[PDB]
Motif scaffolding. Structure first.
Motif, PDB file in Angstrom:
ATOM      1  N   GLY A 165       4.792   3.066  -1.691  1.00 35.97           N
ATOM      2  CA  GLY A 165       4.570   3.462  -0.310  1.00 35.97           C
ATOM      3  C   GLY A 165       3.275   2.916   0.258  1.00 35.97           C
ATOM      4  O   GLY A 165       3.239   2.448   1.402  1.00 35.97           O
ATOM      5  N   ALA A 213      -0.475   6.585   4.390  1.00 28.96           N
ATOM      6  CA  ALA A 213       0.448   6.846   3.296  1.00 28.96           C
ATOM      7  C   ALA A 213      -0.071   7.752   2.189  1.00 28.96           C
ATOM      8  O   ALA A 213       0.751   8.394   1.527  1.00 28.96           O
ATOM      9  N   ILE A 243      -3.758   9.636   1.783  1.00 29.40           N
ATOM     10  CA  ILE A 243      -4.708  10.729   1.944  1.00 29.40           C
ATOM     11  C   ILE A 243      -4.177  11.748   2.942  1.00 29.40           C
ATOM     12  O   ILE A 243      -3.157  11.515   3.598  1.00 29.40           O
ATOM     13  N   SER A 288       6.780  -4.801  -4.175  1.00 32.49           N
ATOM     14  CA  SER A 288       7.425  -3.496  -4.144  1.00 32.49           C
ATOM     15  C   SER A 288       8.695  -3.459  -4.981  1.00 32.49           C
ATOM     16  O   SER A 288       8.908  -2.503  -5.734  1.00 32.49           O
ATOM     17  N   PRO A 294       1.459   7.727  -9.864  1.00 36.19           N
ATOM     18  CA  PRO A 294       2.725   7.795  -9.125  1.00 36.19           C
ATOM     19  C   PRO A 294       3.184   6.445  -8.591  1.00 36.19           C
ATOM     20  O   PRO A 294       2.617   5.916  -7.626  1.00 36.19           O
ATOM     21  N   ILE A 295       4.233   5.889  -9.199  1.00 36.24           N
ATOM     22  CA  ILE A 295       4.694   4.554  -8.825  1.00 36.24           C
ATOM     23  C   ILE A 295       5.302   4.564  -7.428  1.00 36.24           C
ATOM     24  O   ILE A 295       5.157   3.601  -6.665  1.00 36.24           O
ATOM     25  N   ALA A 296       6.014   5.637  -7.079  1.00 38.90           N
ATOM     26  CA  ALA A 296       6.585   5.736  -5.741  1.00 38.90           C
ATOM     27  C   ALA A 296       5.497   5.774  -4.678  1.00 38.90           C
ATOM     28  O   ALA A 296       5.609   5.117  -3.635  1.00 38.90           O
ATOM     29  N   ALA A 297       4.430   6.533  -4.929  1.00 39.95           N
ATOM     30  CA  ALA A 297       3.299   6.547  -4.010  1.00 39.95           C
ATOM     31  C   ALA A 297       2.636   5.181  -3.919  1.00 39.95           C
ATOM     32  O   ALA A 297       2.214   4.771  -2.831  1.00 39.95           O
ATOM     33  N   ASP A 328       7.132  -7.435  -0.229  1.00 32.55           N
ATOM     34  CA  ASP A 328       8.433  -6.935  -0.644  1.00 32.55           C
ATOM     35  C   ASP A 328       8.733  -7.295  -2.092  1.00 32.55           C
ATOM     36  O   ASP A 328       9.348  -6.499  -2.809  1.00 32.55           O
ATOM     37  N   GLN A 366       3.765  -0.783   0.969  1.00 34.66           N
ATOM     38  CA  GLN A 366       4.492  -0.989   2.216  1.00 34.66           C
ATOM     39  C   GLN A 366       3.646  -0.693   3.447  1.00 34.66           C
ATOM     40  O   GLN A 366       3.788  -1.389   4.459  1.00 34.66           O
ATOM     41  N   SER A 372       9.210  -1.060  -8.265  1.00 35.50           N
ATOM     42  CA  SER A 372      10.260  -0.048  -8.241  1.00 35.50           C
ATOM     43  C   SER A 372      11.523  -0.519  -8.950  1.00 35.50           C
ATOM     44  O   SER A 372      12.074   0.186  -9.794  1.00 35.50           O
TER      45      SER A 372
END
Ligand SMILES: *C[C@@H](*)[C@H]1/C(=C/c2[nH]c(/C=C3N=C(/C=C4\NC(=O)C(CC)=C4C)C(C)=C\3CCC(=O)O)c(CCC(=O)O)c2C)NC(=O)[C@@H]1C
Ligand SMILES: *C[C@@H](*)[C@H]1/C(=C/c2[nH]c(/C=C3N=C(/C=C4\NC(=O)C(CC)=C4C)C(C)=C\3CCC(=O)O)c(CCC(=O)O)c2C)NC(=O)[C@@H]1C
Ligand SMILES: *C[C@@H](*)[C@H]1/C(=C/c2[nH]c(/C=C3N=C(/C=C4\NC(=O)C(CC)=C4C)C(C)=C\3CCC(=O)O)c(CCC(=O)O)c2C)NC(=O)[C@@H]1C
Ligand SMILES: *[C@H](C)[C@H]1/C(=C/c2[nH]c(/C=C3N=C(/C=C4\NC(=O)C(CC)=C4C)C(C)=C\3CCC(=O)O)c(CCC(=O)O)c2C)NC(=O)[C@@H]1C
Ligand SMILES: *[C@H](C)[C@H]1/C(=C/c2[nH]c(/C=C3N=C(/C=C4\NC(=O)C(CC)=C4C)C(C)=C\3CCC(=O)O)c(CCC(=O)O)c2C)NC(=O)[C@@H]1C
Ligand SMILES: *[C@H](C)[C@H]1/C(=C/c2[nH]c(/C=C3N=C(/C=C4\NC(=O)C(CC)=C4C)C(C)=C\3CCC(=O)O)c(CCC(=O)O)c2C)NC(=O)[C@@H]1C
Ligand SMILES: *[C@H](C)[C@H]1/C(=C/c2[nH]c(/C=C3N=C(/C=C4\NC(=O)C(CC)=C4C)C(C)=C\3CCC(=O)O)c(CCC(=O)O)c2C)NC(=O)[C@@H]1C
Ligand SMILES: *[C@H](C)[C@H]1/C(=C/c2[nH]c(/C=C3N=C(/C=C4\NC(=O)C(CC)=C4C)C(C)=C\3CCC(=O)O)c(CCC(=O)O)c2C)NC(=O)[C@@H]1C
Ligand SMILES: CCC1=C(C)/C(=C/C2=NC(=C\c3[nH]c(/C=C4\NC(=O)[C@H](C)[C@H]4CC)c(C)c3CCC(=O)O)/C(CCC(=O)O)=C2C)NC1=O
Lengths: 96, 161, 68, 160, 193, 161, 161, 160, 160, 161, 160
Positions: free
Chosen positions: B128, B59, B61, B157, B122-125, B154, B131, B161
């Motif tokens: 990811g 996810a 590197i 996450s 980066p919160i989205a990263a 979950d 997950q 988010s």
């Protein structure tokens, strides 16, 4: 209590338990009870020892956004695997 | 923090009742799944570093994150990011053992959003990566504890988010 | 208001410090009476040895005049 | 409970639970049915236990039911009996939990200040608890009696 | 409402998100009750032209006041003859999901609060705990060299509370190397500098 | 709110003083740059949408903000973010025209930080967008009013952070 | 407010994934448990008033709440009950028709503790009243549908206390 | 969803669920299996549908993929196909929910502002959605094709 | 840099700068042209240095480029050479700044954790850095060679 | 904090680029003016108290500030104002030596405006005092570094105003 | 499998299933759940196990990947890793079946002739299987690790 904690130990308080331990001492012994209880903690001896002066160790994000943060963030959030056209025009100009 | 047993005891004590059939059935409902949770926790503890390595490989590197301009660039930031991954994995393990996301609410997600926004992470990263760790953990533990493990990842996450 | 003249030697076993810990390992210092308990217990729990203790400020059997 | 105590130490050291801690959790969940049985027995026989512990405490020190005593009067003694019922419920909770976090957070922290404010004899309350200890251990088998009495002795120690 | 007197008094000194909350108390006798309501009225206020039917004298305050006055609720309670009145505890059924916020708005010190409260409250209901002092948010001083500021909560009320409990452990940033936070590294104050 | 002239007027009225030579120099200093501010305001008003689009393309989009889990994910959040950008641009133009950040304090900054904290909006990314808008506006208006435009964008960024 | 159908979609949307097997299993489980919910909702309705009366007699009345000093001492304080209740019914009948806590947290159980603290209103008493209605609805509804109604009532009581 | 639109509708009047609403909720739970099957069928063929719909769109409106086009370039075309995949995902969400409530909040409110800011042809995006509708209806039986296509026409009408 | 260090020390002491600090600032500004020339030389000879560092590294530790090796395969050796280029860049930054601050912030703090996670031989990377040091010092005069060798030696020592 | 050299190094490190002709030109431009900054810093350090004395005499004292009702009234407030004036002078010297205002942004201006608003300190009077020190320092240092020192005093004044 | 080995054994005597055989079939069906879970756990981590086992094998026996080695070259190495994957698959088959009957017929009978014809080092293949056993037992709890490793040791012994 919260301000004196930052001065005597380099960090703000962590827990309601940590705040209440000094509060229930301040209601029985006053200012000297609070300061003496703070200076006699195991944390003070472990971190600052006996020769080192106390120093600022931790910051809250609200304070950290005051020192830095002016003029925002110049990095631009990059994210992995995203589709981005940034830099392609510069690369084409250098190739030309 | 609170677990299944302490949660039942507290939610009966605040109403001042004794342990009734409903709370008893809840507590045997926790007791029946004790062995699966401890086995999954032992597996996760034994395979902690490999899970983080595989999740980072899948996810994070080999992307723009680790190149200059990415947040995960530089050794300091790389070490901090893998430390954060270890944080999430260990707290998910604690939540799975206790059968309660109260530890996640009290010691993981409180102010994490604002801290990440202040630091520029980066919160989205991060979601990811969480997950990916969830997928690897579900692979390792097996169907026995896959769902119970996945529900707390979950929860983390959804909180982030 | 009493004090204590204390000489103690604190060895740090597992740290291995790179620079100049004479002043940290072996030292003599003045300590107030009300903090001598905590200071002694700090020395004991670190494996130190309390070489000497002296009154240096007060009187042996004062019922009064010893207020903090 | 034991789960909370293990998790707290693991979080404090920033490490997942050790194999010894996992074995401890396995043993605790194994002992769960016995713990439930002891709690159920005490819950079923609580009222008689309360009444006998009250009688024992009163004939050990009758001064509390004297004119200058804290528990003088019908409604003054009903409160003492209700308090004894409270600690019996707490020790049942501690028995089911496996260690004394609920008892600590519900009935011993600040109890010195509360009883000093109410001017009630804390050592007398401790003897009243010990009477509950005797009456409860009289209604259990030997190792169950030891198990319940360990929590009762914990309460006795925590009182003073 | 659309006169210059109201614009200078309850539109100039306040934020748009506070002007909505004040207009709700002025033209409806109640506080905003939902997050979706705040989005609708803010999107009504914020745009230069919304238009309804035909004409476009609908900018900011003018569009918002028209939307408030033409609402179904207004012409069912204070229809066409009645000056609007406070629908507090005595008058109607009181909602409980904004009791403390609404009864602060109903007070006559409501215009003295410039920080918006209802949009913040409805956002707090659907998000995790903010990180602040375990007590009120005004309890943590400004982080300057020697200030000790401690905002007053009486000079300008911006009161913010959050149910923190007792076992919630705050998240603090490490003023130094990130891998020495002491929460993932138990011995971090002893490694280098 | 207040402009430069009204600010001088109140600063003298609080002392109960007739306006003196120094107040005259302050008023003359404002009056000297009157036309440049009007020209810059007209240019910004004419190029409002292009400035926002270029600033967003430079600082916000093609990021994790626009990907799932980001803060500006979904059409509603994208529209809200560009609406906030338009708000900032318009009030910066008003501050340029009045020659005083009092309107910025009254109508923008009071409580916006706490609202963004409650909503989870990234204040650092917002300030980055404001700075990108500042660069674009300074490019458009030219050297004559570029500095005067830039001072109020810097004011907005410093107030937000 | 969210149901199971909306909750799964919202959880799968922030991470940007199509509905996989786990999501289709959760939705399938709700769809299979979609008739007993509808039947028990109608059963709770009609017999609503007798349920409230029986619960009041079982928990509230015959205590200090009716004697002088109680918070149900006179009528209109009694009348604020049956009301107060009829909520905790109504709601949680909504919950066991669109089964998810969500509605119970957003409309009923949110600031209710603050309102009760400002108005008196013994919270322990109003939680015992909730459990009484839990028992009566479990009796009336049936064997299998006694659960998930017990779930939502327990959630309401636990959240309030 | 229909459950959301029904329960909250009977909550604005302070009544229980109407007997008129102890219906079509029932029809929805009855047709839930069919809706789930249709959504899974669309999800399985997401890449083929997106690819063919993008192909048809680029033939019908070649100006967008021209030098003066919004989607000119390999990565600009990748972004267009990603948007089409996003709308297919939203359509599947609407199909499972049984109402266009989720797709409305996720990808319709503010879409005009977003696409005007990005300078993208909204009629071109609508034609792309129509092509996706045709490709999706080619893979389904008549009833299911109509059921999915009706949501597709909802998206086409809303982007307008 | 030296200015940052001196100013930080003076500010932490709450004092104006000492004359010794001013003298060291004067020396640093005087040596600026020579430091810039050394940085220019290294930057112009960056590619040959990296290639030769790779050659002696793979000769000295052939097990690293071996089937169970961290950098077996053409892209794994590409990444190793990229890391060597990164460290040469940081060395040039350190030479220009006059101290080891940029190297410490960018490529030393946490290098142990990163390379342990990636499973790479840190002693192997240290040997590669030493090979870079040798190749760089063969292209410089004696004073400049010693000046660059100080930073190369610090890098090798810190990676330990 | 950052100086010119570290600023250039970071600006190239974020792009992952070796130092090129432009960066070397910027570094040479800084190094050319090295000795002038040191001489100006020495002059300011030698004349520190005198600069504060003339600045206070020309901008603050002999006014309503020093009288009753004035903010600078009483010995405590007078000492406080002179200490703040000294802090401004010292950090101006630091910024002039480093050739970059990041230390001013990080160590002085952070929250200073909100602090002065809370305490009631007149920001206009503070800016006037800072400009008075600017004129005095420009007189003392001479044409060589007058503008270079002056730009940082203008930075402080604009950050406060 | 156990069922095949038990039923056909009680068919060579013309009798029904033995009362001794209406047992361990029983334990097999009881432990089938654990066997399926272990097989699934091994199957999920097939690529990592194969990669790490090949890495360990190439370190311990580097002569095979030398120019005079059977597996010299990128595709001859790919074939070696494919053989390791084949044997991992056979081990999972044995675990699910509960007997080494399927693995025996699939990949053991005639393996000596096949590898002698191809000129491959059978001791090297056995060591590769041992490395696969170590990597597999690193991912499992103690009981399941022993159960999988027992079949792994069967493969090692048979290739001998
Ligand atoms: C053995 C009884 C002894 C005694 C007791 C006594 N208690 C009270 C009053 C109160 N006791 C409590 C106790 C608790 N609250 C808690 O939460 C817990 C643990 C869960 C406890 C133990 C409280 C709250 C009260 C206040 C009254 C109330 O709550 O209703 C009194 C009355 C005091 C008075 O003098 O009026 C008495 C007498 N007295 C004895 O002599 C016994 C040794
Ligand atoms: C560049 C855009 C960034 C961003 C923004 C964002 N904002 C919201 C929501 C709101 N924004 C405001 C703003 C204001 N109110 C005012 O009065 C003023 C000044 C006059 C401002 C600037 C408000 C009140 C809201 C809340 C109401 C609403 O929801 O519309 C949102 C939506 C958040 C949500 O979905 O709840 C966003 C996304 N987000 C980014 O990532 C950008 C950096
Ligand atoms: C068929 C393709 C059409 C087209 C599209 C196009 N889109 C962009 C850029 C973006 N599109 C989005 C879309 C969304 N964000 C959301 O949250 C949703 C709802 C699920 C959608 C649909 C966004 C956010 C962007 C910005 C970039 C990013 O994603 O980070 C572009 C790029 C334009 C540019 O100038 O960069 C294009 C071309 N163009 C066509 O011609 C087709 C009709
Ligand atoms: C080595 C040739 C001999 C030897 C030495 C030895 N020393 C210690 C422990 C200490 N050494 C020091 C030294 C200093 N502290 C200071 O502040 C300074 C100023 C530079 C010096 C020189 C001290 C005080 C200690 C004690 C604390 C510490 O360990 O740092 C030990 C270990 C003793 C123990 O186990 O506690 C040893 C072994 N031993 C030999 O055999 C050599 C002849
Ligand atoms: C990693 C996958 C992503 C990432 C992360 C990243 N985080 C930081 C710094 C911090 N992270 C934390 C986190 C926590 N502290 C807690 O108590 C908890 C709850 C368990 C969490 C989650 C904190 C507090 C910090 C700052 C303080 C510290 O270091 O301890 C960094 C470093 C930022 C910097 O350089 O200053 C990074 C990089 N970055 C990515 O790109 C990933 C997506
Ligand atoms: C009844 C079992 C208990 C009790 C209750 C009681 N409540 C009130 C007054 C109010 N109760 C509410 C409740 C709600 N408003 C909401 O929106 C919701 C959820 C949707 C709830 C639960 C409110 C807001 C009020 C005040 C306004 C009103 O009456 O509608 C009273 C009256 C108090 C008084 O006299 O002022 C009472 C008595 N009393 C008992 O004894 C029981 C424990
Ligand atoms: C080369 C001489 C040695 C070697 C290296 C090696 N590195 C990687 C992978 C990475 N290396 C880095 C390095 C850095 N990130 C930074 O920010 C810095 C500071 C400037 C450095 C040095 C990173 C981030 C990675 C991860 C991949 C990526 O860059 O995206 C590998 C690959 C390992 C793998 O498992 O793929 C290798 C082989 N290996 C050797 O044997 C040499 C001694
Ligand atoms: C002097 C020219 C003006 C003035 C000033 C004034 N200031 C205070 C009090 C404080 N000033 C500070 C300042 C700072 N903290 C920082 O971290 C920095 C930068 C590093 C600065 C400049 C602070 C924190 C305080 C409050 C604490 C304290 O008093 O020390 C006062 C005193 C106000 C009082 O009595 O409460 C004054 C008077 N006053 C004038 O009239 C001038 C315009
Ligand atoms: C001051 C005005 C006033 C009154 C009177 C009042 C009455 C009152 N009577 C009640 C009950 C009750 N009241 C009665 C009986 C009677 N009631 C009578 O007025 C008759 C004398 C008698 C029948 C002949 C009974 C039997 C109940 C129990 C509830 C039930 O009937 O099921 C209750 C419900 C709570 C409880 O059980 O105590 C109230 C509130 N409240 C008020 O505010």
């Amino acid at each position: 209590i919260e301000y004196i904690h930052r001065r005597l130990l380099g960090r703000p308080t962590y827990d309601r338990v940590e705040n209440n331990r000094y509060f229930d001492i301040a209601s029985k012994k006053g200012f000297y009870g609070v300061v003496d209880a703070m200076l006699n903690s195991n944390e003070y001896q472990e971190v600052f020892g006996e020769d080192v002066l106390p120093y600022e160790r931790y910051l809250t994000p609200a304070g950290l956004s005051l020192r830095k943060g002016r003029f925002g963030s110049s990095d631009v959030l990059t994210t992995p695997g995203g589709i981005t056209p940034r830099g392609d025009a510069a690369r084409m100009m250098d190739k030309i | 923090m609170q677990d299944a047993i302490t949660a039942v005891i507290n939610n009966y004590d605040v109403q001042g009742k004794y342990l009734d059939g409903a709370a008893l059935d809840k507590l045997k409902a926790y007791f029946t799944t004790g062995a699966v949770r401890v086995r999954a926790a032992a597996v996760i503890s034994s395979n902690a570093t490999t899970i983080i390595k595989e999740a980072a490989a899948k996810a994070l590197i080999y992307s723009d994150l680790t190149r200059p301009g990415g947040n995960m660039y530089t050794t300091r930031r790389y070490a901090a990011c893998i430390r954060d991954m270890d944080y999430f994995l260990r707290y998910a393990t604690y939540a799975m053992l206790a059968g309660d996301p109260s530890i996640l609410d009290e010691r993981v997600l409180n102010g994490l959003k604002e801290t990440y926004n202040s630091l520029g992470v980066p919160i989205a990263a991060t979601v990811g990566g969480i997950q990916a760790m969830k997928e690897v953990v579900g692979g390792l533990v097996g169907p026995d504890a896959a769902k119970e493990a996945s529900i707390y990842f979950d929860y983390l996450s959804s909180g982030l988010s | 208001s009493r004090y204590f003249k204390v000489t103690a030697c604190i060895p740090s076993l597992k740290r291995v410090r790179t620079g100049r810990e004479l002043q940290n390992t072996f030292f003599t210092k003045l300590v107030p009476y009300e903090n001598w308990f905590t200071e002694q217990q700090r020395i004991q729990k670190a494996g130190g040895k309390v070489l000497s203790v002296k009154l240096f400020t007060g009187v042996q059997g004062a019922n009064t005049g010893v207020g903090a | 409970s034991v789960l909370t105590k293990a998790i707290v130490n693991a979080d404090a050291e920033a490490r997942y639970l050790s194999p010894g801690e996992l074995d401890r959790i396995k043993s605790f969940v194994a002992s769960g049915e016995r713990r439930l049985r002891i709690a159920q027995t005490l819950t079923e026989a609580r009222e008689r236990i309360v009444k006998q512990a009250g009688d024992q405490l009163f004939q050990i020190r009758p001064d509390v039911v004297s004119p200058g005593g804290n528990a003088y009067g019908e409604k003054m003694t009903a409160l003492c009996l209700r308090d004894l019922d409270y600690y019996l419920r707490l020790v049942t909770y501690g028995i089911v939990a496996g260690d004394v976090t609920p008892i600590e957070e519900i009935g011993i922290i600040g109890v010195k200040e509360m009883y000093n404010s109410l001017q009630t004899p804390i050592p007398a309350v401790a003897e009243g608890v010990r009477a509950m200890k005797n009456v409860a251990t009289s209604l259990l088998s030997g190792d169950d009696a030891a198990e319940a009495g360990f929590y009762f002795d914990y309460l006795v120690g925590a009182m003073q | 409402g659309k006169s210059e007197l109201y614009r200078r008094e309850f539109y100039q000194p306040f934020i748009n998100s506070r002007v909505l909350e004040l207009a709700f108390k002025h033209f409806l006798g109640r506080a905003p009750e939902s997050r979706a309501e705040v989005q609708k009225y803010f999107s009504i206020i914020s745009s230069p032209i919304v238009r309804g039917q035909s004409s476009m004298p609908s900018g900011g305050l003018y569009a918002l006041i028209d939307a408030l006055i033409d609402s179904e609720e207004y012409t069912s309670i204070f229809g066409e003859d009645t000056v609007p009145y406070l629908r507090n505890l005595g008058v109607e059924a009181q909602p409980s999901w904004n009791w403390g916020a609404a009864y602060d708005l109903y007070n006559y010190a409501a215009p003295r609060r410039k920080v918006p409260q209802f949009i913040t409250l409805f956002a707090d209901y659907t998000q995790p705990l903010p990180n602040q002092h375990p007590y009120g948010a005004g309890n943590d001083p400004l982080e300057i060299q020697f200030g000790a500021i401690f905002k007053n909560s009486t000079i300008n009320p911006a009161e913010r509370a959050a149910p923190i409990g007792k076992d919630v452990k705050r998240i603090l940033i490490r003023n130094g190397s990130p891998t020495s936070n002491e929460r993932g590294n138990p011995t971090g104050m002893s490694e280098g500098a």
